[PDB]
Amino acid sequence: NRSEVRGGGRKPWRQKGTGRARQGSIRSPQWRGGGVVFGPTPRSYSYKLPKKVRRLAIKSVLSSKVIDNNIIVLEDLTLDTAKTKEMAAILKGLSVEKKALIVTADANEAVALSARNIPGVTVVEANGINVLDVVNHEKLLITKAAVEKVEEVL
Amino acid sequence: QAKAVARTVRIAPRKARLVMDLIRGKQVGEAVSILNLTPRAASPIIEKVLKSAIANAEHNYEMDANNLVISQAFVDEGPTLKRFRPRAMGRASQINKRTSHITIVVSEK
Amino acid sequence: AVPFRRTSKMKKRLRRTHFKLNVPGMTECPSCGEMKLSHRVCKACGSYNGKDIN
Amino acid sequence: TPMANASTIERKWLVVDAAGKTLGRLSSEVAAILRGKHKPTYTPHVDTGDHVIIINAEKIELTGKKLTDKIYYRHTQHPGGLKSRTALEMRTNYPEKMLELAIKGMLPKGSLGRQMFKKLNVYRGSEHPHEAQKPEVYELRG
Amino acid sequence: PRVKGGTVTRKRRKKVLKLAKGYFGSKHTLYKVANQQVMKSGNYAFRDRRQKKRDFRKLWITRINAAARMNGLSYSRLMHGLKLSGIEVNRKMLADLAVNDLTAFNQLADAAKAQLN
Amino acid sequence: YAIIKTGGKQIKVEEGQTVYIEKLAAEAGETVTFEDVLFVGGDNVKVGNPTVEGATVTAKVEKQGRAKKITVFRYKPKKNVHKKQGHRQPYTKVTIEKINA
RNA sequence: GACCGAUAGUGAACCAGUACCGUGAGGGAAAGGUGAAAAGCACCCCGGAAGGGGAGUGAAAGAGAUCCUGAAACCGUGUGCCUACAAGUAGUCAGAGCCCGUUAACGGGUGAUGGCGUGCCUUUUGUAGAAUGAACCGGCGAGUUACGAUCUCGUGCAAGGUU
RNA sequence: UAUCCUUGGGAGUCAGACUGCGAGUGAUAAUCCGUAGUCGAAAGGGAAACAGCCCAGACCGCCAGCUAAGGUCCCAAAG
RNA sequence: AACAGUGGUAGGAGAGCGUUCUAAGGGCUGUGAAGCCAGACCGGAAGGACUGGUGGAGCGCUUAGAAGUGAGAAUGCCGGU
């Protein structure tokens, strides 16, 4: 702003005897390299909602998928080896061609490391579910144990 | 048609135009004779440009002399040099040393 | 006195009406000279209608 | 969409004597004829009048004492220059000029008015040279 | 973010100069005087679009007056007779037919005279 | 040669010509009949006092459109008052086929 | 990085606290872009040279050294219509004649004649002013953020609400 | 005839001008108060030109008609 | 539909047009994008298309969100003439 630009501090010139405009500083906002009026300043954009609102939101986004049978629940997910080819074969076995969200109980390293590189697949635990993630991806695959744990939490 | 152009000759416009107004649309020999008889600064430059155009027409495109006429001729302005002259009571004044481009295009009548 | 207002292009162009040059006096080449001036010498050899001088 | 007029017209020739008639009561009618308001093809921006010849212009008449009181002034643009003439001198020395002034003052100003005025011919006496044009006599309707 | 603001002012200013085509001298090149003149011609047209309505009635009246005086009537008497000899609703524009076909106009004048006396 | 009244105005029509008038609210293709016939010319002359009795003029419609745009702009000096808008006045084109006196 | 993109961002994207100014403390700039590759124009002609016209390289030479793009102010060459009797905030409405032919539309350019018509902003009871301001063009340039107070609207819950 | 009250949210304005009508002044030679209008914030028509006088309140288009103040010999429409 | 209304400075209220960035979908470009130039096209305004030339590699549409958000005047600043 006006008081942080290097320089200034004195009248530019006396500017008297010929009748020029009464300049006060060479860093005024209207000069060529002067300060900036208002403009951006560091701050943080973040607020919070009541807890019941968050619970209702997550319930609604979960039920919306069930409304149009976009939720596929399977007995269990198990990969002996962390191979992306195996994960691609599993996805192709089902009718999953767009971005999909994998939900598993606790945390499985093999599945997380096998589906990591596929462009549209994201892996989260039952504790890490959220509205934006589930509302973004199209098809949600969830382990039955994860279903039970999510039911218990809410 | 044959063209000859001189770029940034140290001569101000509005002074070369006076001479160029005399030789526009006339025959080549008459134009050269006119240019040889007027005591002004731009005449030697314009004569050289005209003769260069004549030589280009004769050599490159295989045209004929004694049959050419000055179809096009004009003077444009170019880059300007700015200088300063001191004046009384500690003041300054600006001086513009101007430059011009000269173009001549001859053709068979 | 300083000008009260600027002058338009039309007035300037109309003022420059009489500011032009004149076509010189054209005569014969003296002693096969090059198209000399009236009452003067040939450009080639300073000739007076064939009467060379200087 | 009415019809204007453009160069496809004819101009007649009329002769009016000024014996006995007063100045204004004749000048008004003559000016109206000159502007061309007496024909149904009138047009503001085009000359549609006729040619008016006046004879016996020296026998004009004025009512009251105006003949010795109406004064014509003019200025020569020099300081102190203001020339005056009584109506009697104007009548007995320049009879045509008085009629011309009276009629001219009654015509619109501008280019068309001054071009309209060129159709008026005023003669002192009872003789005019306009014979090849075959003038037609015209009495003052008003 | 920062909006530099280019490419918008030129597009808007160029449209003003396009309506000023045909003006005398610098009024068709410089933006400020062009804008001043285009605004002034804005209400010069509104004023004249209503004067035009009352500038042709005058022409029609003058022509009808001349044509009627060619018959011995005047304009006022002819109009009163027409308004009274029945009505024959006839705008002055359509009674201008004295110029084209003079015979019918004489018939109308004859009817008006017949009722007027 | 007939003088008809339409659209709050009066026009003169002879068969074979085309005229532009105010909107007739008629779809392009059908036939309209004008009833207000004031004058009839040519050979015999008929002058109806309000109207000529038993006279109808026939025409057909082929186009309904709008005229060229007129931009209305007004302003007041020194008081900062501007106003701009546009206008395109509708019209209907018809050609006469029978005066039908 | 819902930060800037060469008048912005550090004063400084470039030999910058440099050039320059002042005895001294001190003040303090302007200036980016050939091409994928120098393949940066051998050779011929005019010219003292600079600069041009051919030939050649290259997709492009109208990319040839301040070299991507190249607006406005300003300066010129050619031409269709008008102009040497005319009084002018020069435009608008009506209108002959002449020249053209479009995003085909009750088309385009010019314009003799007729009517009307005292620029823009600011301020004042009131301005055509002889009250202020602008030579012209281009770029930059003025109601925001944080914390409190009160009111309207929306959503969740409800004698409870909420970290 | 359709305006009025209460509550709550935002304002701007703060000792204007002229012309008629009734009272008191300088010296009824620029003033004072009460009352009405217009301009301020209002274009159009008439007073030759003329914020305050007379008629009258502009959403836009039309080459349609009737009138107000004021007018009808020529400028300039109408006896 | 039928009635009624639509001059306006300081001000109060409402509905809209444009510019840069972010999120998803949908899709245009070397068979020529942004920018610049010309035109007799379209909406009630702010404005938006369509053809042709130049240009030589990036841009836009629909729905939301955030603002260094729109210039004719400050004897404004810088540059060019």
Swiss-Prot record, chain A:
Organism expressing this protein natively: Bacillus subtilis (strain 168)
The protein's assembly and partners: Part of the 50S ribosomal subunit.
Residues of the full protein shown: 53 to 206 of 207
An individual GO BP term: translation
Region (Disordered): 1-33
Transmembrane regions: none
Keywords from the named record: Ribonucleoprotein, Ribosomal protein, RNA-binding, rRNA-binding
Protein name according to UniProt: Large ribosomal subunit protein uL4
Function: One of the primary rRNA binding proteins, this protein initially binds near the 5'-end of the 23S rRNA. It is important during the early stages of 50S assembly. It makes multiple contacts with different domains of the 23S rRNA in the assembled 50S subunit and ribosome. Forms part of the polypeptide exit tunnel.
Swiss-Prot record, chain B:
Keyword Transmembrane helix applies: no
Gene Ontology terms: cellular component: cytosolic large ribosomal subunit
Keyword Ribonucleoprotein recorded: yes
Protein keywords: Ribonucleoprotein, Ribosomal protein, RNA-binding, rRNA-binding
PROSITE patterns (UniProt xref): RIBOSOMAL_L22
Molecular function via GO: rRNA binding; structural constituent of ribosome
Pfam family, one: Ribosomal_L22
Matching CDD domains: Ribosomal_L22
Domain of life the protein comes from: Bacteria
Gene3D superfamilies: Ribosomal protein L22/L17
Alphabetical GO biological process terms: translation
InterPro entries: Ribosomal_uL22, Ribosomal_uL22_bac/chlpt-type, Ribosomal_uL22_bac/org-type, Ribosomal_uL22_CS, Ribosomal_uL22_sf
Subunit (UniProt): Part of the 50S ribosomal subunit.
Protein family membership: Belongs to the universal ribosomal protein uL22 family.
Role this protein plays: This protein binds specifically to 23S rRNA; its binding is stimulated by other ribosomal proteins, e.g. L4, L17, and L20. It is important during the early stages of 50S assembly. It makes multiple contacts with different domains of the 23S rRNA in the assembled 50S subunit and ribosome. The globular domain of the protein is located near the polypeptide exit tunnel on the outside of the subunit, while an extended beta-hairpin is found that lines the wall of the exit tunnel in the center of the 70S ribosome.
Protein name per Swiss-Prot or TrEMBL: Large ribosomal subunit protein uL22
Curated annotation (Swiss-Prot), chain D:
Entry superkingdom: Bacteria
GO cellular component entries: cytosolic large ribosomal subunit; ribosome
Family to which this protein belongs: Belongs to the universal ribosomal protein uL13 family.
Gene symbol of the encoding locus: rplM
Gene3D superfamilies xref list: Ribosomal protein L13
Family matches, as SUPFAM superfamilies: Ribosomal protein L13
Sorted UniProt keywords: Ribonucleoprotein, Ribosomal protein
Pfam families, per the entry: Ribosomal_L13
Keyword Ribosomal protein assigned: yes
InterPro entries associated with the record: Ribosomal_uL13 (IPR005822), Ribosomal_uL13_bac-type (IPR005823), Ribosomal_uL13_CS (IPR023563), Ribosomal_uL13_sf (IPR036899)
Record flagged with keyword Ribonucleoprotein: yes
Function: This protein is one of the early assembly proteins of the 50S ribosomal subunit, although it is not seen to bind rRNA by itself. It is important during the early stages of 50S assembly.
Annotated source species: Bacillus subtilis (strain 168)
Protein name (database record): Large ribosomal subunit protein uL13
GO molecular function, one term: mRNA binding
Subunit and interaction comment: Part of the 50S ribosomal subunit. Binds to Obg (AC P20964).
A GO biological process held by the record: negative regulation of translation
Curated annotation (Swiss-Prot), chain E:
Cystine crosslinks: none
Gene Ontology molecular-function annotations: rRNA binding; structural constituent of ribosome
Pfam families: Ribosomal_L20
Keywords annotated in UniProt: Ribonucleoprotein, Ribosomal protein, RNA-binding, rRNA-binding
Gene Ontology, cellular component aspect: cytosolic large ribosomal subunit
Any one biological process term the GO annotation gives: translation
InterPro entries noted in UniProt: Ribosomal_bL20, RIBOSOMAL_L20_CS, Ribosomal_protein_bL20_C
HAMAP family xref list: Ribosomal_bL20 (MF_00382)
Similarity comment: Belongs to the bacterial ribosomal protein bL20 family.
Function comment: Binds directly to 23S ribosomal RNA and is necessary for the in vitro assembly process of the 50S ribosomal subunit. It is not involved in the protein synthesizing functions of that subunit.
Cross-referenced NCBIfam families: rplT_bact
Quaternary structure and interacting proteins, as annotated: Part of the 50S ribosomal subunit.
The protein, known as: Large ribosomal subunit protein bL20
